[PDB]
Amino acid sequence: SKVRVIVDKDPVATSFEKWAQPGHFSRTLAKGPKTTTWIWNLHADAHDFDSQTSSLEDISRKIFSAHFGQLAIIFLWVSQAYFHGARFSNYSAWLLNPTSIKPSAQVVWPVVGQEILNGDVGGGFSGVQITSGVFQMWRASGITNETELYWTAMGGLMMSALMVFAGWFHYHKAAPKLEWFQNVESMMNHHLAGLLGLGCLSWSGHQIHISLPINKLLDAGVAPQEIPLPHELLFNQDLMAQLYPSFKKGLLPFFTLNWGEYSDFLTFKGGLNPITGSLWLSDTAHHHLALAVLFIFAGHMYRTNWGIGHSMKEILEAHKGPLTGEGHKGLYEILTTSWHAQLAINLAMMGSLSIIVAHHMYAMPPYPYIAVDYPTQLSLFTHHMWIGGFCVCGAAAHGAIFMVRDYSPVQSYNNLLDRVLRHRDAIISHLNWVCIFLGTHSFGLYIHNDTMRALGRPQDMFSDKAIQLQPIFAKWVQSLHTLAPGNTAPNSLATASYAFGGDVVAVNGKIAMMPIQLGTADFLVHHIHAFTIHVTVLILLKGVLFARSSRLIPDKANLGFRFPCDGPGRGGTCQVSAWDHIFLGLFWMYNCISVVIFHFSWKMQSDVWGTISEKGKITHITGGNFANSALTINGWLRDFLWSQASQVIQSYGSALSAYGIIFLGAHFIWAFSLMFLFSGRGYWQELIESVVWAHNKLKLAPAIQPRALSITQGRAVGLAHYLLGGIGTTWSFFLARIISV
Amino acid sequence: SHSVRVYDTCIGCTQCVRACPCDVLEMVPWDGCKAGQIASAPRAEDCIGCKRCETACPTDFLSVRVYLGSETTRSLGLTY
Amino acid sequence: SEFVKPYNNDPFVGNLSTPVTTSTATKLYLGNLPIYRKGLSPLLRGLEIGMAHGYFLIGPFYILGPLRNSPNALLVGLFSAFGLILILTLGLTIYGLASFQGTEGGENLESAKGWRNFTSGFSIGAFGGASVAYVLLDNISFF
Amino acid sequence: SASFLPSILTPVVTLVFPGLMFALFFVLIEQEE
Amino acid sequence: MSKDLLKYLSTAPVLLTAWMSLTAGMIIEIQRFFPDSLSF
Amino acid sequence: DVSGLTPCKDSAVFKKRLDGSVKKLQARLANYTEGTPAYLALEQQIDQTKARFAKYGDKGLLCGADGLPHLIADGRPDHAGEFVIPAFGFLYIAGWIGWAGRSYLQFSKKTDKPNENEIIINVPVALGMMSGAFLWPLAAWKELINGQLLVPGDEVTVSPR
Amino acid sequence: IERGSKVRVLRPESYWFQECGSVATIAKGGDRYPVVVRFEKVNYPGVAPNNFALDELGEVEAP
Amino acid sequence: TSDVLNLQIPTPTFGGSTGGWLRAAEIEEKYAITWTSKKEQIFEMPTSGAAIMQKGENLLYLAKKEQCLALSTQLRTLFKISDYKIYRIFPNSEVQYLHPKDGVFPEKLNEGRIGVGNVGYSIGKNPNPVNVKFTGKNTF
Ligand code: CLA
Ligand code: CLA
Ligand code: CLA
Ligand code: CLA
Ligand code: CLA
Ligand code: CLA
Ligand SMILES: CC1=C(/C=C/C(C)=C/C=C/C(C)=C/C=C/C=C(C)/C=C/C=C(C)/C=C/C2=C(C)CCCC2(C)C)C(C)(C)CCC1
Ligand SMILES: CC1=C(/C=C/C(C)=C/C=C/C(C)=C\C=C\C=C(C)\C=C\C=C(C)\C=C\C2=C(C)CCCC2(C)C)C(C)(C)CCC1
Ligand SMILES: CC1=C(C/C=C(\C)CCC[C@H](C)CCC[C@H](C)CCCC(C)C)C(=O)c2ccccc2C1=O
């Protein structure tokens, strides 16, 4: 038995002693503050466990306990949504009419005149409108009662207390040894089967036994208070057979492999449910079954205590070719002896997954009546875009940290990491050329369109009435997807999503999903997206590759991961660290995500969202102006920003006035960022000296000497303020626009 | 080329010589301090101006001072 | 095997002997172009570069120019190609003036006489190639 | 007839003059001792 | 309580948060009892 | 009166703003059933609006042509309910805060670990100075006369100039 | 001045100009700056002491 | 030592990197470092990558003095080699000896060195820049 549980007993005593000794974790900060830099260094080095201890075992134990604390915070955050739905919401009135009642689960206290924020959301309720989509998520689970929300909140509180106790227990009572964490094959098998496949299996079971009958009865017109309770549906084959006439046969067709008898509640019809404008829940349960079987099957791959299985060291070391030398040899030790490498991979995967979630949940609305809730769709898309962008920047940050700290040349000789590091100039040069080519083309077409329209030459533009740039490949892929049911998806009733072409889906006048037509403006903005992604990749990859050394500075690894410069020498070595590369790439991530969400908002308001009247008359929100106005920068400025800021600037005196307040405040914070971003430390230090003179004159000098913020801290403060102001301005603008139309 | 000067507040604690990445500084005998040595800059044409010596000086307002001046292919750190 | 090795058997030069840099196909291609072909005077190198470049340069002005939907499209494209060729010739002359000063001359390209011969060949070749592609474009229905 | 002077002087000045000045300035930059 | 938990509660961020919460509470209750005051 | 302004109790635009403010909430009130806490909250808002406007009329504020109260920071005695009396109140409170901070600074300087007394506050002593700073205009004057408030000037550090 | 004296620094380019410090050691030899003064406030590099000459210290308190 | 370099010293086995010297090393200035090893081991190159150092004597060409001194710092703070020599090769095959000049390291005192750039007063007693106006000289 090689895979075993080895655990130390009572390693660290639980005491409130180092709570009163701040900065105890590091050697330098524990000696007490002399200046007002020890405070910021205390805050910056709190989670840098690799610089506190040289033992990987203690670092891993700290990571595990911190994971438990994070999971406790997330459980409390789930419990807040369930409790606010139970006690502070209009979820019942929304259930009785989920097309005219606006969801709201957040009520303000009247003290200062802020009771105007309690708007008329419908159903005899006053509160702030909710764009989280938790109401549709609860309706997709069959939570028609307000008691089940309360008990879900109580269970979430219990689970959060459990995670707090587990975090204390695994650091102070039973902390696992280093050999426990390095069982990556066992961890991989257990995650792939028990977490993913068993979660899919249990959720498919809940779906089949609770959400399918309750949502079927809800779509049939039965009021929520006359629907059988989920425990009355769980153990009633007669009632389920009344709803789905396949439970008469019971579990026997499952074991006899006659799975075709279960096609009443396990379908592959595709498309959207016409009643709710969402995916069929039978398709969802079938999807979760397929995923559960696939994940449990995949969790049987890696070797554990028994002789069957794979070793991941042998898989990696067998993959090598002529052009790559030793191949993947030595990556197993890298990924089993370093946490920063695992962050660099997992953050990239999680950011890309969040972006995939954003692209998939708008064209395929998975919750009932979420497609006709336009604020929910816009908020979810923009949210997951921003989360994905932040995580994909953090992946490059931790790759740089690994390259500075945990890299070893003796371990990684002539493998893929060494070969990548030995030709980094070619990579950075060619990616530089690609960035310049994409930028010149994609942006100069916009500038050329601006010039032609300003010179009174619309016939010389890059438009559909002019020189055309038709995205022929995307149109071909759309035509392939539209013809998939029957030909390349023979057991399919409808298309995967209606964005690829097909039929307009309408739920009580509003458009749920209709085909999205691609023109030359779509070609132009997709090339803009590719260019912005490429420049962000250029900055982050240059930071990762040149983290150890460069032609300018041969010993950059000896200076650390983050450091301000190496003096004014060599003409100037400002922002040479990989940290400054992450700092510069975060701005370009912000630019890319802002352009992506602007494209989404304008295209969906212009060509998808709207109303339908008699004889299929489609009237969109903005009037189909994306095709001719998204070709010029002036068209963007006038028809998107100026035209859609009318809702956020006229929100004063109404229930949306908080959005205007946050609009102004986020503009203020964004402008406040440039103070740190443009200026430098020495001026502020001299001004602080001038203030310290007056303080010394009035016997007011603090013993902790006041200092200006450090150069790295000044850059970090400016970047954080810039991101907060930008995301706040876009947040308030989107929410105030899309709530009011 | 930059110009490097060492003033008589030197204590001969050698940190500037160790901090130098371009072999500009060296220790010469002296009699004005307890250590019996003072820093010197005999190879100021190899100075790049990164001021690592000025970060390493412990004396109040550093004794070794680097003044940025003319730029050559060595003081710019150009490999091309 | 190992198809990426140090460039020209020196492991410390800033280049690699990849299948792109040191293949026999790439050597045959980039050892037989006019700027690299053996036994060529600089004037002939410039001429052979210029005719291809002029043919090229009259390419995009005729199709995408402001007067593309005009009966005088090909003439305007030819004149625009002539202007761009003149600008490139002026750039070549000023590059030769700034780069090759106090040189011994000869059949080497990196000299005053060699670069003057190269620029003269490029200019006459570029004007000729633009004219030839004008003639072929005016009678494109022949093919 | 003074209706020719814009179309004569504006291209000559604005295009030809700074191009020759850029070429001359570049040559004067790169001449050495 | 303890001789060392009180020392943690005596730290600058905990005391700042507690005192700002007390000040905000006092001002909010004053606004609740004496609202919309422009003049004295 | 002052600057051509009229009293808010004698201004028609102020009464028009009153009517508009109550009519907006009355129009918001019509979609709620009576006895529901939303209805009670809205009528409480209406009563609060009426009380606020009546108070602004009664306090003697001056409204302009827009019907909004205009504060006179001149220093006239009949407008001392404006700036001057809150000025005295804030000056007292700000001097209280400054003197409490200065007294605790002196105490923390006179101890053995001045740095640790500023990140970890000596709460009993801090409360002592904080409550004893109520007589700051007298204590500060006594320290100024005694010569303990101000450093002579040759003892504070200065830049070379 | 003696060891343990409280002195005021008169060097204009020093961080502790017109500030009080404590004499630590007076070296008896050919040193140009023999007196060692230790201060309670660190400078920008964080260095507490410095070597000073006998004419750069104004003296405040005897040992 | 003197201005002599053995051109036939074996080099560390390196797979070739895109960090080596460019065209202005055979034209303007080139640097080399030679050291003595006791065993065959792997060291990190200052121009990225990893190379195996040969047991015995090694020779390595770099483009600037900073790279040679960074490699020497690596050969000191890590596995102990303290007899490295840094040279400067001119395009006319002329070599000049730079590091360990007088034979000993610069941090250790050596009798026979002359102080260059020493100033006989404190830094706060420099002349004002008005007193050097229209003279060409400076207040350093
Ligand atoms: C099938 C067994 C199993 C399961 C379910 C998990 C599940 C988890 N592990 Mg884990 N692990 C396992 C085996 C397993 N592990 C083994 C064998 C090893 C050693 C090789 C590890 C080593 C390991 C490390 C080192 C870490 C984890 C972490 C995690 C968490 C990832 C965060 C996440 O996705 O949140 C999803 C959240 C939930 C699913 C909420 C439920 C939380 C409980 C604890 C899950 C199990 C509940 C219970 C078994 C099911 C009862 C069913 C009942 C209702 C009928 C997750 C809770 C990480 C973490 O977050 O640490 C805390 C982490 O750092 N694991
Ligand atoms: C899985 C997520 C994850 C994890 C575990 C870590 C973990 C770590 N990161 Mg990391 N990082 C991440 C994501 C993550 N990061 C992402 C997504 C980015 C891109 C933005 C970065 C960018 C990054 C950099 C650039 C650096 C790190 C560093 C570190 C290390 C020390 C962090 C520390 O002490 O901060 C302590 C925690 C704080 C100081 C709190 C920060 C508070 C933020 C700035 C403000 C948040 C504002 C809030 C959202 C809204 C306020 C609203 C307002 C109205 C009040 C640690 C190993 C540092 C290091 O040295 O690594 C070795 C380092 O230099 N990370
Ligand atoms: C609107 C402001 C703006 C603009 C135009 C640019 C432009 C550019 N940045 Mg950038 N940057 C900005 C703000 C801006 N930045 C800010 C605020 C920051 C701080 C975070 C940065 C940080 C930053 C970094 C860190 C990097 C860049 C890079 C780049 C270049 C991308 C390559 C490219 O496509 O160039 C092509 C030129 C353009 C896209 C702009 C002009 C396009 C015109 C309209 C068409 C072509 C005109 C033609 C050349 C001239 C004809 C007219 C002339 C004859 C008169 C490009 C020069 C990257 C780079 O240089 O690497 C390649 C890079 O790594 N920038
Ligand atoms: C990069 C962006 C971009 C692009 C693609 C264009 C494209 C165009 N512009 Mg334009 N323009 C731009 C930006 C751009 N503009 C900007 C930013 C401005 C404002 C300053 C203008 C202002 C402007 C005006 C005022 C006018 C145009 C006009 C035109 C048209 C004719 C121009 C022409 O023939 O040039 C000459 C083109 C060439 C010499 C071709 C060179 C490019 C070749 C194809 C590169 C090939 C590389 C090759 C593939 C490498 C591989 C080789 C390998 C196989 C060996 C053309 C459609 C004219 C018009 O009326 O339009 C209809 C016109 O009057 N432009
Ligand atoms: C500084 C003053 C000034 C400025 C800004 C302009 C600007 C202009 N003139 Mg003009 N002009 C000026 C003085 C000026 N003029 C004077 C004093 C005369 C009388 C001889 C003229 C006679 C004149 C004619 C006849 C025409 C113009 C035209 C034009 C336009 C096209 C540019 C051109 O071809 O100019 C060409 C201008 C000249 C050859 C005359 C020289 C201009 C002055 C003397 C030079 C001043 C230099 C100035 C101090 C800047 C020095 C720095 C510089 C070297 C960078 C442009 C709007 C054309 C037009 O109307 O287009 C629509 C046109 O046909 N100009
Ligand atoms: C109680 C402490 C205290 C006192 C008495 C003063 C007194 C003074 N400061 Mg000051 N200051 C302080 C703390 C203090 N400061 C702190 C903590 C900071 C950092 C944020 C500053 C930053 C600062 C600047 C940047 C400037 C002054 C200036 C001034 C002078 C003019 C008044 C003024 O502008 O106030 C304004 C005061 C502030 C903006 C800071 C107030 C911050 C809080 C509210 C005060 C601290 C209270 C403290 C936490 C109480 C704890 C003690 C308790 C344990 C008993 C005056 C001598 C100005 C000057 O030089 O004029 C000649 C000037 O330009 N101060
Ligand atoms: C909402 C929420 C919650 C809740 C949750 C829940 C409610 C859960 C549940 C869960 C569950 C309830 C789960 C279950 C599961 C189950 C399973 C997972 C089963 C499995 C089974 C199997 C696997 C079987 C097998 C078999 C076969 C088939 C053959 C052989 C034999 C046997 C029988 C063994 C809480 C409060 C926490 C918090 C908040 C949120
Ligand atoms: C009549 C009036 C007015 C006017 C006023 C004025 C003009 C004033 C002035 C004032 C001034 C002209 C002042 C001055 C001052 C000076 C000084 C010099 C001061 C100082 C102070 C101090 C020094 C303080 C200190 C302290 C204390 C005591 C407390 C706190 C803490 C401390 C330490 C800070 C008006 C129209 C507005 C309105 C009406 C009324
Ligand atoms: C202003 C500025 C400073 C000075 C900034 C300092 C000293 C920060 C001071 C931090 C304060 C004390 C934190 C608390 C701020 C206020 C006391 C509280 C304001 C609360 C609001 C929400 C009202 C730098 O040190 C700096 C360094 C490098 C680049 C740019 C800059 C820079 O721009």
From TrEMBL, chain F:
<keyword id="KW-0934">Plastid</keyword>
<dbReference type="GO" id="GO:0015979">
    <property type="term" value="P:photosynthesis"/>
</dbReference>
<keyword id="KW-0603">Photosystem I</keyword>
<keyword id="KW-1133">Transmembrane helix</keyword>
<feature type="disulfide bond">
    <location>
        <begin position="8"/>
        <end position="63"/>
    </location>
</feature>
<keyword id="KW-0150">Chloroplast</keyword>
<protein>
    <recommendedName>
        <fullName>Photosystem I reaction center subunit III</fullName>
    </recommendedName>
</protein>
<keyword id="KW-0732">Signal</keyword>
<keyword id="KW-0602">Photosynthesis</keyword>
<dbReference type="InterPro" id="IPR003666">
    <property type="entry name" value="PSI_PsaF"/>
</dbReference>
<dbReference type="Pfam" id="PF02507">
    <property type="entry name" value="PSI_PsaF"/>
</dbReference>
<dbReference type="InterPro" id="IPR036577">
    <property type="entry name" value="PSI_PsaF_sf"/>
</dbReference>
<feature type="transmembrane region" description="Helical">
    <location>
        <begin position="83"/>
        <end position="99"/>
    </location>
</feature>
<keyword id="KW-0472">Membrane</keyword>
<keyword id="KW-0812">Transmembrane</keyword>
Automatic annotation (TrEMBL), chain G:
<comment type="similarity">
    <text>Belongs to the PsaE family.</text>
</comment>
<comment type="function">
    <text>Stabilizes the interaction between PsaC and the PSI core, assists the docking of the ferredoxin to PSI and interacts with ferredoxin-NADP oxidoreductase.</text>
</comment>
<protein>
    <submittedName>
        <fullName>Photosystem I reaction center subunit IV</fullName>
    </submittedName>
</protein>
UniProtKB/TrEMBL annotation, chain H:
<dbReference type="GO" id="GO:0009535">
    <property type="term" value="C:chloroplast thylakoid membrane"/>
</dbReference>
<keyword id="KW-0793">Thylakoid</keyword>
<dbReference type="GO" id="GO:0009538">
    <property type="term" value="C:photosystem I reaction center"/>
</dbReference>
<comment type="similarity">
    <text>Belongs to the PsaD family.</text>
</comment>
<comment type="function">
    <text>PsaD can form complexes with ferredoxin and ferredoxin-oxidoreductase in photosystem I (PS I) reaction center.</text>
</comment>
<keyword id="KW-0603">Photosystem I</keyword>
<dbReference type="InterPro" id="IPR003685">
    <property type="entry name" value="PsaD"/>
</dbReference>
<dbReference type="GO" id="GO:0015979">
    <property type="term" value="P:photosynthesis"/>
</dbReference>
<dbReference type="Pfam" id="PF02531">
    <property type="entry name" value="PsaD"/>
</dbReference>
<dbReference type="InterPro" id="IPR036579">
    <property type="entry name" value="PsaD_sf"/>
</dbReference>
<keyword id="KW-0602">Photosynthesis</keyword>
<keyword id="KW-0934">Plastid</keyword>
<protein>
    <recommendedName>
        <fullName>Photosystem I reaction center subunit II</fullName>
    </recommendedName>
</protein>
<keyword id="KW-0150">Chloroplast</keyword>
